[PDB]
């Protein structure tokens, strides 16, 4: 189920309570929560 809702969620000027992952090493096995945040390592000079 999905329905439009900015009249409740879009605080004017910008809402910042909503965040989503962008970079992860592995594609995500179905039905798991991966809360923890760390830093991504790309090729040489890995970053932690």
């Amino acid at each position, epitope marked *: 189920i999905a329905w439009n809702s900015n009249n409740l969620d879009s605080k004017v000027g910008g809402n*910042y309570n909503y965040l989503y992952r962008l970079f992860r090493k592995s594609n995500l096995k179905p039905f798991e929560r991966d809360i923890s945040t760390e830093i991504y390592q790309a090729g040489s000079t890995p970053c932690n």
Partner: antibody
Amino acid sequence: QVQLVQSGAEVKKPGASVKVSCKASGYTFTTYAMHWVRQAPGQRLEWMGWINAGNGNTKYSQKFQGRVTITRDTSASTAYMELSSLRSEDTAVYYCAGGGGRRLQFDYFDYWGQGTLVTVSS
Amino acid sequence: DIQMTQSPSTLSASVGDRVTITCRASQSISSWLAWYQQKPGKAPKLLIYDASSLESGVPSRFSGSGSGTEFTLTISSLQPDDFATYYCQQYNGYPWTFGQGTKVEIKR
């Protein structure tokens, strides 16, 4: 219990700049939310801005745009505030607030610093 | 910008009584609000957020209500620790503002 503590009293002069800072003590830092607010004596509280103690984000006010800045130090787990071009009005008491904990951000201040006193005089 | 004004201003009471506060908004608010207690010479303490919820560690007396614009706080019995101002915070939009201040005094 999370607690916030910060610097003592200050006195400055017009045109100068001042740096107040508060140290955090929280059970986890799940994108913590140090979040500044000020109070002229006997007046309405006024809200400064919020630093994203997770990484670096720096949403600020609009009445105070272009002259106030905020940073934080990860290792010390403190929050840094900076204001310039002061003037006799900004005489106030300055506060640290924030500290959601369960979710990552709010916009309500649930952990308050014990207050910092700033006097702009000549 | 959102304006926040509280119609009651100062109020009166006596121990063991109930009080009410009104917080009106210039515009529509979707039940985004919080209520802070501030004793003189101290730091603010939060009581209610999202206009309804009761935040932990507080006496059960406090209770929020209301939606839309007119918002209300209410306590059943008036304990001594209730003797200070109370502010309402909007957080519907950007720059977040505050109220005016609503103090209560013993009446005799």
